[PDB]
Design a binder for these strands. Structure first.
Lengths: 465, 56
RNA sequence: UGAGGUAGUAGGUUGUAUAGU
């Protein structure tokens, strides 16, 4: 009885000023907008890690294909898709001895085991970056199977997180060093054998997709922008607010809100929030004290001024929970009178499974549902005709947007969200369920709330994923 | 006099429309023996680039 | 990457140990 209005797929800008829907296929067609001249890879690990990383990179030099590449497109080779060169030569390596590994591993406490391993890795990165006459732009540490399976918190035979890469990145924030974490099981599925025999990380049919993801992550961390967005109106900032909960022992952790800002470029000019003991989790509705609200808004405004040399005529605010009215009263007292405030709440737990009456494929991605002029249902999950398969399993679930306060066209915020949800960098996929500013929200909150020693972190995005 | 092949707003659809021209069809240069799987995988197995319309 | 599993709070119910006139 009621229609499902569809929103067209926004095309991402590519090389030579052209646009295509799929990032993989079009990136194989055109390439990156601004080519880099190449980067040096610093692998930190063992000799086995050395040989397996060199073998994997030599494997991804030559073109490799997936099982069917309508869904997971081809990988023509790193030089054949990015332009910048990558070879096994001129690769810097740092020795990780078993003696330190064994001396650390023989301790029973797993948390201090994580502590000493991250301390060793950070110290070796520091002594590789502070005295070596050579230059490394990207680091690729390798964790073997035994370290990953023995550092689990609940494996049975306080100021830091139990997991590795979160606090590695958190302690590596201050020195402005980009790096990537690679599991041994990820790139060595050939010899990674379980009890049965099959690879646990069975990347055999999608080694092209694995090469796609790794190469895109490396080119992102290199410094060259892989892609940008197609259509952006002048004077809009997508401020996706984070409210990742922090559990630093028994001190008042409360709220540690953060944000990612999209003004005119794909990268998120992320500014750290406060440690922030206010708003006792009895009132754990994750609102904002006015002074931090104007602090964050002024931070975004001066970021827009320093990166665009003008004033933003419109503000987008994204979150998961609802918004109050006093925080917006504090917001509007500092905004210019020509601005516009929009607060959109994104939820997933709402149960709504539009089953298909007849056919062989479910509801596609992009078919939105309008309830009111302020709230709507958007399907960023499911079938897409370009990839010719769904991105979900069983039946996908949509996202429910809701403009809390502020007047706006629901179609405008729908198109803005659909344009935002196609910039996943660490994973090379056509689209995801949640938007990118919310997909990266958990990562940025985890990184910025893992080490309290960080005060003013680097506001470029390359040091996080 | 002659037909103008579109290449202005995009290049991939213009390229496939160029492929649609006669005596320049999807067959690669009348392939005698081999070297056909790669190109068919690249192009004719990747025919899908846009959407379609139907009521469901 | 989406569906199940535990701690417990959005916001109004009624049990503890005082004090308004």
């Amino acid at each position: 009885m009621k229609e499902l209005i569809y929103i067209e797929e926004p095309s991402i800008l590519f090389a030579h000023g052209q646009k295509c829907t799929d990032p993989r296929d079009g990136l194989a067609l055109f390439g990156p907008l601004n080519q880099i001249y190449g980067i040096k890879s610093g692998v930190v690990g063992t000799q086995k890690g050395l040989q397996i990383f060199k073998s994997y990179l030599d494997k991804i030099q030559k073109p490799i294909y997936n099982h069917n590449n309508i869904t997971r497109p081809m990988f023509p080779g790193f030089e054949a898709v990015f332009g910048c060169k990558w070879e096994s030569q001129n690769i810097v390596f740092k020795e990780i001895t078993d003696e330190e590994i064994r001396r650390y591993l023989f301790n029973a406490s797993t948390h201090k085991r994580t502590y000493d391993l991250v301390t060793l890795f950070n110290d070796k990165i520091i002594t590789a970056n502070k005295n070596d006459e050579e230059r490394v732009d990207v680091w690729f540490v390798i964790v073997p199977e035994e370290i990953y399976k023995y550092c689990r918190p609940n494996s049975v035979l306080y100021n830091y997180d139990a997991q590795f890469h979160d606090q590695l990145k958190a302690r590596l924030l201050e020195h402005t060093i980009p790096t990537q974490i690679l599991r041994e099981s990820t790139l060595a599925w050939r010899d990674f054998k379980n009890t049965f025999g099959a690879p646990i990380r069975d990347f055999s049919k999608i080694e092209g997709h694995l090469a796609w993801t790794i190469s895109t992550a490396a080119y992102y961390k290199a410094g060259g922008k892989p892609w940008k967005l197609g259509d952006i109106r002048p004077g809009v900032c997508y401020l996706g607010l984070v409210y990742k909960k922090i559990e630093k022992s028994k001190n008042p952790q409360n709220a540690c809100c953060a944000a990612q800002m999209f003004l005119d470029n794909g990268d998120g000019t992320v500014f750290k929030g406060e440690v922030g003991p206010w708003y006792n989790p009895e009132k754990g509705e994750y609102h904002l004290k006015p002074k931090e609200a104007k602090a964050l808004l002024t931070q975004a405004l001066e970021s827009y001024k320093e990166q665009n040399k003008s004033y933003p005529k419109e503000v987008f605010i994204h979150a998961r929970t609802r918004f109050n009215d006093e925080e917006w009263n504090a917001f509007n007292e500092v905004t210019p009178k020509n601005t516009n405030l929009v607060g959109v709440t994104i939820t997933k737990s709402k149960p709504l499974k539009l089953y298909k009456t007849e056919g062989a494929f479910p509801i596609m991605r992009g078919n939105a549902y309008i309830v009111d002029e302020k709230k709507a249902f958007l399907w960023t999950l499911g079938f897409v005709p370009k990839l010719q398969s769904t991105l979900s399993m069983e039946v996908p679930n949509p996202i429910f947007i809701e403009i809390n306060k502020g007047e706006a066209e629901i179609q405008q915020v729908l198109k803005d969200i659909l344009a935002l949800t196609k910039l996943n960098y660490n994973a090379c996929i056509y689209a995801d369920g949640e938007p990118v500013t919310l997909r990266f929200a958990n990562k940025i909150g985890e990184i910025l709330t893992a080490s309290t020693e960080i005060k003013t972190p680097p506001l470029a995005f390359k040091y996080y994923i | 006099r002659l037909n103008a092949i579109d290449f202005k707003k995009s290049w991939a659809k213009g390229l496939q429309d160029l492929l649609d021209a006669f005596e320049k069809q999807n067959v690669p240069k009348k392939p005698p023996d081999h070297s056909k799987s790669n190109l068919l995988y690249q192009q004719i197995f990747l025919h899908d680039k846009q959407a379609i319309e139907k009521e469901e």
